[PDB]
Amino acid sequence: HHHHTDPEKVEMYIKNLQDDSYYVRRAAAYALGKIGDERAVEPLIKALKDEDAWVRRAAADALGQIGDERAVEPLIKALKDEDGWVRQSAAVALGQIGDERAVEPLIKALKDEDWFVRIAAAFALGEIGDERAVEPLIKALKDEDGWVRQSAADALGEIGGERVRAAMEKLAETGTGFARKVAVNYLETHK
Template identity: 40%
Template sequence: MSNLSFEEAINNLSDDDVKVRKEAIESLVGITDEEAIEPLIKATTDDNAQVRFKAAEILGSMGDVAVDKLIEEFTNAEGKDKRFLAFALKETEDEKVIPYFVEAVDDEDFGVRKVAVRALGELQADDELDTIAKCLEDEDWGVKLAAIQALGDLATDEAIQLIKDARKGEDDKDFKKSCNKAIKKAEKRQKAKASGETVVKVIPMSTIKEMEKTNMQKAIKEYERYVEAKMAKDAPYKRLCVLYRKENDYDNEVRVLETAIEVFADNDKKASYFKKRLAKLK
């Protein structure tokens, strides 16, 4: 773990030594201070890919705090400088960025177009079906695949039909596999919605556990998706309680415990763990 202060980390982002810059960016993980926004935005154009990516990831995790400044910078940026700003905007998960991604699907840089169309799917921009479909004709293969994934995220009948039409028009086996995967995902989401389940995008627990080592705030965010969906897996609730305890966040720990008790009301063995922990807090 780095012992850099906030001021030292910000200053070191401009150091000539890439090792110093890497240490600086790692020490800023989980930061929400507005003073970090501009230095981090500058870091998204760093010569080192690791620094660029981590800067964008941190900005995205800041959410509302950084989104307006990110939009401003994204609108004025050009070429490759927009790529990691696009990623940061996508990671904010703020619906206000949708119009900017709609415009960005026509960007001259294929990397920006790819992130833009993928974001429209992840943000559930149902009204932008035609915009996403347009990307199926993009000259870049990666953008076309991103469009297929985005349509799978939307999971509407119209989106599924577009995927099927695209699959029919291509001979490439890998492309067809991607289409089949997207259709399967979309149909699964449709069934979940039809049964009244909350559809939430989650990533594997093992991935989040590893994430705890490098970005605790993002790990908390990913665990919270399990709680939001009230999934019947006790591990996410347990890990969240541990992380909120480390953060001295009493209110959120209590909220997670009460949610877990509700979810596992019919499972005495699992519920008892959360009841005992809650009793100790109160």
């Protein structure tokens, strides 16, 4: 890395975002994410509306890797995409960008019908590190999906702070099952 961006290469891939082939558009989004240059942001925001879900997924991933805050509002809209894997990608991307504007929408995604979206929402909330997400993550310790539970537990640990500690104490006192184990372990290992 630490590459100086080759303008001809970026221009080439940006143009390929308009190719007739979904594969070429997908590959261009992927390439642009790896290059990491902000010239790609507005073109990728458009690709985030591509007719092909595979292209939309790749565009969200690339926007996350570039990390430009102009992507936040469009990715927030992508959290409502009809395609579950696009929502998952948008959640992951928003986590990577780290912008607090994504917190409320991600909390909503914690209730998504798809388990893989919920995992990504939990993870992203952990990465952003905003205490706002404590109660929603606490509730996710009761999720039907065991991986979602685990991701929420990890996210609480990433956020840390007094509010998490206070919530863990309540669970330590009166919680049961997985949530209790999470809380007791947390308190034993923290401060």
